[PDB]
Structure 1
């Protein structure tokens, strides 16, 4: 018996597009009304400071190229000059039961995966993965470049049942560390709530409110809208920021990628900090191919070893595999 070839693990822990507004610190308690940060426009005259060749380039050509300016046009977004706090608000559906997919060839593989995910729900419900998701919510990983340089970052997490509240935590993202993962009673409570929310025990819907003193007038960093620019259609414009209806927003993909930094046992290194959890797991910015497929430590070959040969490595690799299936994606080519 072989396994299914067309498989589609689905999205789970879906965050919303984070909207940004701006106001003053210590009046953040009664703040549901702050005006949105909007993407402004300005012009740039710069030099050319990139690396330049010494072969097949004329001396007069590079003398004419360095000494002539570059006049591009970019987008920015700043806080107002009397507002020193970047508010970031988003919601987070926690669905439940990310084990089984909904695209399967083999019925025997599908209920076999149901057998092993019911085994994992039986012996221990989602505890350390819930710890790591609740701790990424606890600090400000969703604040990417908004985090560094801030003197005070607060995370407030409310839970939704009806037009009312169920619990109101309060997390100090400066006091809560960045690298070494610990556990505390509020973090235990949030990890327990979404621990119920992950194993299909019902419906969990959260909304997270963040605050950050940066300083009045400073640069915020919404995400960047992409463009191909392959050859022709060069353009007067660069740095297209991302927006919604009249506000500066962060993509769902990148705040989800901020939620999915779990793996501390990748085989390349273990003291540099965690990386992003994905098959062929390697962060995009570094470019170094972490989690080489020629070892047994993929999601592909490891799932093929774990569902046919019925053997197992240590429990942390299974935490990585269960984080892969909570992540979603494609198994097989």
Structure 2
């Protein structure tokens, strides 16, 4: 038995575009009429600060390249001067039916894949993964750089049943950690709801609203976009930001990465913070690859060592394999 030539999973954790508006703290309860954070367009003048490679490191060439500046016109997003908190709103829906592929070639492979996933689920359900996803929702990690230096973050997680809010959660995102996954008495209801959503029982759609008290008229950081900067004029757009209908926003997959930053089982060091569940678990910031395929601890090795050869991994790595199935993609070729 080999892996199927096609095998593809949908994503079972779908957030929207986290769109951001601005306002004043302590009036954040009546905060459905707040004005959006519009993306303005300012002009910067940069100077040379990159490393010279000892070819232009001459006394006259550097003095001739200092006098010719680098004029650019960048997008920017800021709170207004009368607003000192940033409200970032999105809706996350948890689909469920995790280990069922969406397009599988072989039947003898997918039947035993469903058997291994079902053996995992009835052996130990999605409660660990839902606990870690509820921690990445309660600890407001989806404010990526709108969280550093913030004074007080506060997250409101509703539970929109049929339009009517059935259940409410209010977390202080800086009280609970960003590293240690400790259990809380209130967070376990949200983890139970996400576990019920992933296990199939019911339709789970949450509305996540994060208020980060930045400061009066400070800078917020929405998602940034791709530019094909072939040639630049006097001043040409060198940085543009995301905006859904003239209102700044974070991309749906950047506030999805900060939801599945649950991987703390990687072999390098479990004390250097969790990383994102990816095959050959990687971070482009650190520029390295945890779970190297020279080791036997990546996703694409443990998968066909669990399904084909029936070598069940450690209990803390089955969580990683099932979380990578929840993330999605096409596996196997």
Regarding TM over 0.5, the answer is yes
TM-score normalised by length of structure 1: 0.96
Q: Does 1:117 align with 2:117?
A: yes
- Structure 1 residues 172 and 56, CA, compared in 2 at 3 Å: closer, same or farther? closer
TM-score normalised by length of structure 2: 0.96
Structure 2: stretches of 5+ with no match in the other structure = none
Query: Displacement, 1:59?
Result: 4.2
- Assess if the C-alpha contact under 8 Å between 2:134 and 2:191 holds in 1: yes
Instruction: Give the match's secondary structure for 2:112.
Output: helix
- Structure 1 residues 196 and 231, CA, compared in 2 at 3 Å: closer, same or farther? same
1: CA distance, partners of 2:124 / 2:234: 55
Instruction: Give the match's secondary structure for 1:243.
Output: coil
1: CA distance, partners of 2:125 / 2:89: 29
- Structure 1 residues 38 and 56, CA, compared in 2 at 3 Å: closer, same or farther? closer
Query: Displacement, 1:256?
Result: 0.2
Instruction: Give the match's secondary structure for 1:234.
Output: coil
2: CA distance, partners of 1:233 / 1:98: 50
User: Residues 76-128 of structure 1: CA distance to partner in whole angstroms, max 9, x if unpaired?
Assistant: 01001001010011000111111111111110111111111221222222111
User: Residues 27-48 of structure 1: CA distance to partner in whole angstroms, max 9, x if unpaired?
Assistant: 1111111010000011112221
Structure 1: stretches of 5+ with no match in the other structure = none
- Structure 1 residues 210 and 56, CA, compared in 2 at 3 Å: closer, same or farther? closer
- Assess if the C-alpha contact under 8 Å between 1:96 and 1:202 holds in 2: no
2: CA distance, partners of 1:192 / 1:42: 46
Query: Displacement, 1:173?
Result: 0.5
Instruction: Give the match's secondary structure for 2:103.
Output: coil
1: CA distance, partners of 2:19 / 2:7: 34
Aligned CA RMSD, in angstroms, stands at 1.7
2: CA distance, partners of 1:275 / 1:251: 19
Aligned length: 333
Instruction: Give the match's secondary structure for 1:154.
Output: strand
Query: Displacement, 1:182?
Result: 0.7
- Assess if the C-alpha contact under 8 Å between 1:223 and 1:251 holds in 2: yes
Query: Displacement, 1:306?
Result: 0.8
Residue in 1 that maps onto 2:154: 154
User: Residues 48-68 of structure 1: CA distance to partner in whole angstroms, max 9, x if unpaired?
Assistant: 111112136654322201233
1: CA distance, partners of 2:283 / 2:186: 30
Q: Tell me which moved more, 21-30 or 60-69.
A: 60-69
- Structure 1 residues 274 and 234, CA, compared in 2 at 3 Å: closer, same or farther? farther
User: Residues 237-263 of structure 1: CA distance to partner in whole angstroms, max 9, x if unpaired?
Assistant: 101111110100100010000101011
User: Residues 236-289 of structure 1: CA distance to partner in whole angstroms, max 9, x if unpaired?
Assistant: 210111111010010001000010101112122221111111111111221112
